[PDB]
Design a protein around this motif. Structure first.
Motif, short mmCIF file in Angstrom:
data_model
loop_
_atom_site.label_atom_id
_atom_site.label_comp_id
_atom_site.label_asym_id
_atom_site.label_seq_id
_atom_site.Cartn_x
_atom_site.Cartn_y
_atom_site.Cartn_z
N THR A 133 0.45 1.75 4.48
CA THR A 133 1.19 1.90 3.09
C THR A 133 0.34 2.08 2.00
O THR A 133 0.60 2.77 1.08
CB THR A 133 1.84 0.36 2.92
OG1 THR A 133 3.08 0.30 3.86
CG2 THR A 133 2.49 0.53 1.51
N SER A 140 4.95 -4.16 5.67
CA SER A 140 6.29 -3.70 5.39
C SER A 140 7.31 -4.19 6.50
O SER A 140 6.91 -4.16 7.66
CB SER A 140 6.00 -2.13 5.60
OG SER A 140 4.96 -1.78 4.43
N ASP A 168 6.13 6.26 6.22
CA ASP A 168 5.68 5.10 6.05
C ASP A 168 6.49 3.98 6.60
O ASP A 168 7.24 3.37 5.94
CB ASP A 168 4.99 4.53 4.96
CG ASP A 168 4.33 3.22 4.80
OD1 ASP A 168 3.74 3.12 5.93
OD2 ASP A 168 4.55 2.55 3.66
MG LIG Z 1 2.90 -1.09 5.38
#
Ligand SMILES: [Mg+2]
Ligand SMILES: Nc1ncnc2c1ncn2[C@@H]1O[C@H](COP(=O)(O)OP(=O)(O)O)[C@@H](O)[C@H]1O
Ligand code: VO4
Length: 697
Positions: A162, A207, A426
């Motif tokens: 990220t 994430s 991502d």
């Molecule tokens: Mg991430």
């Protein structure tokens, strides 16, 4: 074979994986023993099989591109990355086609605008390894030949995907600056992080969703807008956290601002008050001021054109979810449940979402059954009631997340012709914990598909393009993960068997797990049953073995909410909530499969630019080099194989007719005036890197 005395070789070691050893005596060919001298001064006779990897000179070690190594083997790669990282404090290194990126776990002053422009206009190899160079090369190739590009970052959880993605987008925004649409597309990241990221034991800013951001460019290659695609958000995160894990960041940002006059009507308090935010035992992240983060989130919303009223509406939804989690559900005996209509948290939950507390209290503890002949109302046990309540909470948040992304995409629209685009991928990285469930299975499956996409373009395509030309080419071996993928996604696979069990009204996790056992135990080498468990199964992924618990797989794959609860929120007097649950069969697993198919195709229709992220240690320590954990990641990503194929690849190719101007035998003769730096095919010639540009001069 010449392992003369005085030089060095690598041998196996427990702690550091490999260790250097000096050849004390010269090597007699065919000998099974090798006179070595350990670093501690201990002599030995290494049982070799005509052999040990040769250590490269101290002059070739530490270079920017690992293809420049004389001896390409795992010890050399491991050692080179160690001294570049641990000693030179260099986190970026070229490994041929790919960029390698080591997580520093320390803020480095190497992303300023001065450095950005220093990379602009330059070629790939002109400058030191950097994420900006990868981005520049994509931007460069997009302009010169009008091709769509993809920045594809990969690596396990917490490796730095990220951070890499955002810095890559930061580059594009700076060089390709036009209206400041650039500031808006960059702002899309922190917004989605606030509502899509959460602390896990692997990463403080993990994430919990996958994203693919297409950045649109005009004919002048200036940014005109962008579009964001999201992939399977983690819903259980909303109502459950393991030890030392948090809910999504925005919940804590909101609670940290509970006493601000603007938020006081939300009747909030500390994050420790609410069951949905307190469960992990720690509501604070080290070096993160949630209150200050709320302020930045508000600023970021405003930057995207979302004013105060818009922000308070989403904060109202979020506060409602928190209050819902604190609604008391009491037991009535052992078969019934009950919620007081005067329950404090229920009353504000209903007020914020404009609902009738009587109907919510009723249908949290009862389920309606319509058979088109009768209508049966059965009580729910307290566990079932809590489950139905949590499922509702997860649904509200899912809609809210989709609503935010949908509005972000509206803000980044453009009324013009998209010349080209650069997509930045991502997704959540490969992860494994003590207790792995459906969530981890999906994430690891997604990562499996990315490695497939990678191998196909780097190994399958590139070599097949060379092979069918009839040119001498030693094929590079790589771990094809098609088998484990088939085990998961194909017919009669795990995800297909799961869907079948979900169709059964009396379907269960245990019966599904048994069908996995019967079908795959001692049948598929990648599927294993632990001896000391009949509630789990282990899969051999490309990265590692992962044991999965079967509990909750059906429920999570179905992802349903009781009809009566949906109707109550569908009749919401709150416009935003009513919008979520307005009326407008497939499982989570099937949808996830289909979504990933489209993504792979989207990537395959672009020129890929790969970035391999690597977590150096598991304690988030600055510039700490854990050899065992690192070499595991290097093997999973196939770094050694990538460097090898990159090294022997011929970048420049010419057709014979083109070659004449500067026939087949005439060109081969003039070429001799070494023999390794070029090869001749059926209709094409090929050259080594930079072995021709000197003729141009
Ligand atoms: Mg991430
Ligand atoms: N280049 C970097 N510089 C400083 N810190 C970094 C860098 N890359 C990663 N980190 C640290 O690692 C953490 C997690 O990185 P992240 O990119 O979220 O990993 P992933 O997305 O692969 O899970 C970040 O919060 C940050 O503190
Ligand atoms: O922890 V990360 O999910 O963002 O790979």
């Amino acid at each position: 074979e010449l392992y003369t005395q005085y030089n060095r070789v690598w041998i196996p070691d427990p702690e550091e994986v490999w260790k250097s050893a000096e050849i004390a005596k010269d090597y007699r060919v065919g000998d099974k023993v090798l006179r070595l001298l350990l670093e501690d001064g201990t002599e030995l006779d290494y049982s070799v099989n005509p052999l040990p990897p040769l250590r490269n000179p101290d002059i070739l070690v530490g270079e920017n591109d690992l293809t420049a190594l004389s001896y390409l083997h795992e010890p050399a790669v491991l050692h080179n990355l160690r001294i570049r990282f641990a000693e030179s404090k260099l986190i970026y290194t070229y490994s041929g086609i790919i960029l390698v990126a080591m997580n520093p776990y320390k803020q480095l002053p190497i992303y300023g605008d001065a450095i950005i422009h220093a990379y602009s206009g330059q070629n790939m190899g002109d400058m030191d390894p950097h994420i900006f160079a990868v981005a520049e090369e994509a931007y460069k190739q997009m302009a010169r030949n009008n091709r769509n590009q993809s920045i594809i970052v990969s690596g396990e959880s917490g490796a730095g995907k990220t951070v890499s993605a955002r810095y890559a987008m930061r580059y594009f925004a700076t060089v390709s600056k036009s209206a400041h649409v650039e500031d808006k597309v960059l702002a899309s990241n922190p917004i989605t992080e606030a509502v899509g990221n959460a602390k896990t034991t692997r990463n403080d800013n993990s994430s919990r969703f996958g994203k693919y951001t297409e950045i649109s460019f005009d004919e002048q290659n200036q940014i005109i807008g962008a579009n964001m695609s999201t992939y399977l958000l983690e819903k259980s995160r909303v109502v459950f956290q393991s030890e030392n894990e948090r809910n999504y960041h925005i919940f804590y940002q909101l609670c940290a601002s509970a006493q601000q006059s603007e938020f006081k009507h939300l009747k909030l308090g500390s994050a420790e008050e609410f069951n949905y935010t307190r469960m992990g035992g720690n509501t604070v992240i080290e070096g993160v001021n949630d209150r200050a983060e709320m302020v930045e989130t508000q600023k970021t919303f405003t930057l995207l054109g979302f004013k105060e009223d818009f922000q308070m509406d989403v904060f109202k939804i979020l506060a409602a979810i928190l209050h819902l989690g604190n609604v008391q559900i009491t037991a009535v005996g052992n078969e019934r449940s009950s919620v007081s209509e005067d329950d404090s948290h229920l009353k504000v939950f209903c007020e914020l979402l404009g609902l009738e507390s009587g109907r919510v209290a009723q249908w949290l503890c009862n389920r309606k059954i319509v058979t088109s002949s009768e209508t049966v109302v059965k009580p729910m046990t307290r566990p079932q009631a809590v489950n139905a309540r949590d499922a509702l909470a997860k649904k509200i948040y899912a809609h809210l997340f989709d609503f935010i992304v949908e509005r972000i995409n509206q803000a980044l629209q453009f009324s013009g012709k998209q010349h080209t685009f650069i997509g930045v991928l991502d997704i959540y990285g490969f992860e494994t914990f003590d207790v792995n469930s459906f969530e981890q299975f999906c994430i690891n499956y997604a990562n499996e598909k990315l490695q497939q996409q990678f191998n196909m373009h780097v190994f399958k395509l590139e070599q097949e393009e060379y092979m069918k030309e009839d040119i001498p080419w030693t094929l590079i071996d790589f771990y094809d993960n098609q088998p484990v993928i088939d085990l998961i996604e194909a017919k009669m696979g795990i995800l297909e068997l799961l869907d079948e069990e979900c169709l059964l009204p009396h379907g269960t996790d245990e019966n599904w797990l048994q069908k996995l056992y019967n079908n795959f135990v001692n049948r598929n080498p990648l599927f294993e049953k632990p001896r000391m468990s009949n509630t789990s199964f282990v899969i051999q992924h490309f990265a590692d073995k992962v044991e999965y618990k079967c509990e909750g797989f059906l429920e999570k794959n179905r992802d349903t909410v009781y009809d009566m609860l949906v109707e109550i929120l569908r009749a919401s007097k709150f416009h935003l909530c009513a919008n979520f649950f307005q009326e407008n069969r497939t499982t989570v697993g099937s949808k996830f499969r289909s979504s990933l198919y489209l993504l792979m195709e989207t990537l395959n229709a672009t020129t890929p630019h790969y970035v391999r992220c690597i977590k150096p240690n598991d304690e988030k320590l600055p510039f700490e080099f854990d050899s065992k954990r690192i070499v595991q990641q290097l093997r999973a990503c196939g770094v050694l194989e990538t460097i090898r194929i990159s090294a022997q690849s011929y970048p420049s190719r010419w057709t014979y007719i083109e070659f004449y101007s500067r026939k087949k035998e005439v060109c081969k003769v003039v070429l001799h005036r070494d023999s390794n730096q070029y090869q001749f095919g059926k209709t094409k010639i090929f050259f080594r890197a930079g072995q021709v540009a000197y003729l141009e001069k």
